[PDB]
Design an enzyme around this catalytic site. Structure first.
Site, PDB file in Angstrom:
ATOM      1  N   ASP A   1       7.058  14.227  -7.953  1.00 56.15           N
ATOM      2  CA  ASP A   1       7.005  13.098  -8.879  1.00 56.15           C
ATOM      3  C   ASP A   1       7.632  11.849  -8.269  1.00 56.15           C
ATOM      4  O   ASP A   1       8.861  11.705  -8.271  1.00 56.15           O
ATOM      5  CB  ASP A   1       7.747  13.473 -10.166  1.00 56.15           C
ATOM      6  CG  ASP A   1       7.734  12.370 -11.198  1.00 56.15           C
ATOM      7  OD1 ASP A   1       6.941  11.430 -11.043  1.00 56.15           O
ATOM      8  OD2 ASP A   1       8.508  12.476 -12.181  1.00 56.15           O
TER       9      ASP A   1
ATOM     10  N   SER B   1      -0.461  -5.038  -7.163  1.00 61.23           N
ATOM     11  CA  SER B   1      -1.876  -5.045  -6.843  1.00 61.23           C
ATOM     12  C   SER B   1      -2.416  -6.465  -6.937  1.00 61.23           C
ATOM     13  O   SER B   1      -1.973  -7.262  -7.750  1.00 61.23           O
ATOM     14  CB  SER B   1      -2.628  -4.109  -7.796  1.00 61.23           C
ATOM     15  OG  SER B   1      -4.031  -4.191  -7.633  1.00 61.23           O
TER      16      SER B   1
END
Length: 330
Positions: A35, A199
């Site tokens: 994770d 992004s």
């Protein structure tokens, strides 16, 4: 040193991925959920409340000659999906894919929430976010990666998750046969303890690319792709009959649909998520309403590039003095 381990979807939907991890001496192999959005290595154990164990493999520290109780240490964690676990702490030898750390903090669960109990395939979590998020008190502990880093050939790990198929976690090297083209690296902020990056935009299907900054986290422990409501609405508007359902808890779509792809930007590069990766199947057994793999982050407080996004890429988690993230197509 290096390590390399195969990671395997837990079910036919890729709801999560498990990777075998050797703990203790002799080794006890548990299948952990790696994770990159948390920083605790915790396991089902011989200390876990019996009624809360249902099929998981447990770590039994009393059977490990290298286990040592970390005196006074406790841990307690709550995840974004509302699940939680807590317990006490041992140090022990932990190996992943041939890479060994001695003295790793292994957090033994005394209590786990129902979602953990109900998932027989996940024996615990191995956190790969920054150690500043580790919950051990009163002395915070380091992640497996943080402990291994100095010994690694290169201070990196890579996630290569498969779509409906196994993939690989590598530690200490970049497998140049595992991706196509080049790896595009992008800046990371560690301020919130995550692999947080920005992004450069998105496209829906064959549509034009929209240049827009989307801050979010690369999180292997989250199944879906969670993005701003504007972006998510633009995606689902291209699917006839798709709608946001408050009763179901997100966007659903007719199972008869063919889903468009979703592209996200990494610098000037583009990662394309095929439409099929966005299908999470019937909302309930036998239903013709299917659950979407792109959902709104509104009210999460952060955008999350979960498995739906990451499995479309070869992803480098670069833990150099100034960390960065790399993405390649594959």
């Amino acid at each position: 040193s290096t390590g390399s381990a195969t990671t395997t979807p837990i079910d036919s939907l890729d709801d999560a991925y498990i990777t075998p991890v050797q703990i203790g001496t002799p080794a006890q192999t548990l299948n952990l959920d790696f994770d990159t959005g948390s920083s605790d290595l915790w396991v089902f154990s011989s200390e876990t409340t019996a009624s809360e164990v249902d099929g998981q493999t447990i770590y039994t520290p009393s059977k490990s000659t290298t286990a040592k109780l970390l005196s006074g240490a406790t841990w307690s964690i709550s995840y974004g999906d509302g699940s939680s676990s807590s317990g006490d702490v041992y140090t022990d030898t932990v190996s992943v894919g041939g890479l060994t750390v001695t003295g790793q903090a292994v957090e033994s669960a005394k209590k786990v929430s129902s979602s953990f109990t109900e998932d027989s395939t996940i024996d615990g979590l191995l956190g790969l976010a920054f150690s500043t998020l580790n919950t051990v008190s009163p002395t915070q502990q380091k992640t497996f990666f943080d402990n291994a880093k100095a010994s690694l050939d290169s201070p990196v790990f890579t996630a290569d998750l498969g779509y409906h198929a196994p993939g690989t976690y590598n530690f200490g090297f970049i497998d140049t046969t595992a991706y196509t083209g080049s790896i595009t690296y992008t800046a990371v902020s560690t301020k919130q303890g995550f692999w947080e990056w920005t992004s450069t935009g998105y496209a829906v299907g064959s549509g034009t690319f929209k240049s827009t900054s989307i801050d979010g986290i690369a999180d292997t422990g989250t199944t879906l792709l969670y993005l701003p409501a504007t972006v998510v609405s633009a995606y689902w508007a291209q699917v006839s009959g798709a709608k946001s359902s408050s009763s179901v808890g997100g966007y659903v779509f007719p199972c008869s649909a063919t889903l468009p792809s979703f592209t996200f930007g990494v610098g000037s590069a583009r990662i394309v998520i095929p439409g099929d990766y966005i299908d999470f199947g019937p909302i309930s057994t036998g239903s013709s309403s299917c659950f979407g793999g792109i959902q709104s982050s509104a009210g999460i407080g952060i955008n999350i590039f979960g498995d739906v996004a990451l499995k479309a890429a070869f992803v480098v988690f670069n833990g150099a003095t100034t960390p960065t993230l790399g993405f390649a197509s594959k």
